[PDB]
């Protein structure tokens, strides 16, 4: 069996430094060429750096050229990535990747990936969420749509329920997105029958454990 | 090299034959790799050298192509195949570049589009967020038009994931503007093009 385990990720102030680690097992680390590949849901995957098996040739992407320092330790079978001058765009799930063992002059594909480590580059401190209503106004698709807008909270995560956990069918809690302000934001929408707008009350329950804040919000249609 | 994968997202069913097309801006010979990534999981290599299967991958996955055009083929889709597939180039000095990926989802139901004006509470906060909701319906990438003017950079998009509860999925595009930059415009619209078929839900500020 062969595996890779990352570590060292977390929230880092912009412009500061953060070093990520990668523990190797099962395979001969010294005989393989390693990689760092990050990923953000908004832009997909992106290659960062490669280091040769002997540490001779090291290359970096243009977006990370001169700010990232890739290195490896064949003694401890560890792959490390020193990140300096971290900008907000560096926020991504970093994977340490192993190339496929190829014989010849050319490299190969990526046959080994770690579970990934999350780094969040933001200057934001702990902040409670601001929940705003998404009022329904008849609407289409056979039913009506309403939701809550969890905006400007940091850090992750926040748990969203509807009607104190009773309402779960049609509840679509969107994954959070890191805004340009450095804070997180997400929307949790639920499709309800148009008849029950004036009958049933719809209240979302947003809990932000890092800020110890529990915000409930009753969404009602606007006249 | 820029890897472009079309379509961005594709609906399929169990047992269907799926053919995902990958295009490279330049020529990469046969140095192309295919990957499968489940939500929240590490990418899993499927095919290397654009025609060679990886150890452990079932025979239903087949790959072909060279130069600029490549295709990933699944003879018969399986329940554990619904994921996002990426193609990556590693030819010559062109280092390593992935495509935007193609998400293979399960069908079904009623495609509906909603648009929510910024709440009055948020307007007091000085922020104006217009949220466009897509239900059981996917775009080919959702556009924003303010006073019939295409927007860019100020919109942020997110998508849910299907689960055992139901095959319902959703996509939300949020247009974040300041209160000062929101009172200066009246018509806010959200156009989503799917097929040959854009639906443009809009509203005038106030009512």
């Amino acid at each position: 069996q062969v595996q890779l385990v990352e570590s060292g990720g977390g929230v880092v102030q912009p412009g500061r430094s953060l070093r990520l680690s990668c523990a190797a097992s099962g395979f001969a680390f010294n005989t393989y060429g390693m990689h760092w590949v990050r990923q953000t849901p908004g832009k997909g995957l992106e290659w960062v750096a490669i280091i040769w098996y002997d540490g001779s040739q090291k290359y970096y992407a243009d977006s990370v050229q001169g700010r990232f320092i890739i290195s490896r330790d064949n003694h401890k079978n560890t792959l490390s990535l020193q990140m300096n001058g971290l900008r907000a765009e560096d926020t991504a799930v970093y994977f340490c990747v192993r190339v496929r063992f190829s014989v010849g002059p050319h490299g190969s594909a990526f046959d080994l990936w770690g579970q990934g480590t999350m780094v969040i580059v933001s200057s934001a401190s702990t902040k409670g969420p601001s929940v705003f209503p998404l009022a329904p106004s008849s609407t289409s698709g056979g039913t009506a749509a309403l939701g809550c807008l969890v905006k400007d909270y940091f850090p992750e995560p926040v748990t969203v329920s509807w009607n104190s956990g009773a309402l779960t069918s049609g509840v679509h809690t969107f994954p959070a997105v890191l805004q340009s302000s450095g804070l997180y934001s997400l929307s949790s929408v639920v499709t309800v029958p148009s008849s029950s707008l004036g009958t049933q009350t719809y209240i979302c329950n947003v809990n932000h454990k890092p800020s110890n804040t529990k915000v409930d919000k009753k969404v009602e249609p606007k006249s | 090299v820029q890897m472009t994968q079309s379509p961005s997202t594709l609906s399929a069913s169990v047992g269907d034959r799926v053919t995902l097309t990958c295009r490279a801006s330049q020529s990469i010979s046969s140095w192309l790799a295919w990957y499968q990534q489940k939500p929240g999981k590490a990418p899993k290599l499927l095919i290397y050298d654009a025609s060679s299967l990886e150890s452990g991958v079932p025979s239903r996955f087949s790959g072909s192509g060279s130069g600029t055009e490549f295709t990933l083929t699944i003879s018969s889709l399986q329940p554990d195949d619904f994921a996002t597939y990426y193609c990556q180039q590693y030819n010559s000095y062109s280092f390593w570049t992935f495509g935007q990926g193609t998400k293979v989802e399960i069908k079904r139901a009623a495609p509906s589009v909603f648009i929510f004006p910024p709440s009055d509470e948020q307007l007091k906060s000085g922020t104006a967020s217009v949220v466009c909701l897509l239900n059981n319906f996917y775009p080919r990438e959702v556009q924003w038009k303010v006073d019939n003017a295409l927007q860019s950079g100020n919109s942020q998009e997110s998508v849910t994931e299907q689960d055992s509860k139901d095959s319902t999925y959703s996509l939300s595009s949020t247009l974040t503007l300041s209160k000062a930059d929101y009172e200066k415009h009246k018509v806010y619209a959200c156009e989503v093009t799917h097929q040959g078929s854009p639906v443009t839900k809009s509203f005038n500020r106030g009512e």
């Binding site: 040739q57 010849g104 | 030819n91 010559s92 390593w96």
Partner: peptide, 10 residues
């Protein structure tokens, strides 16, 4: 400067 995509293994 040679090809960076050259075989990075042993």
């Amino acid at each position: 400067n040679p090809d960076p995509n050259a075989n990075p293994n042993v």
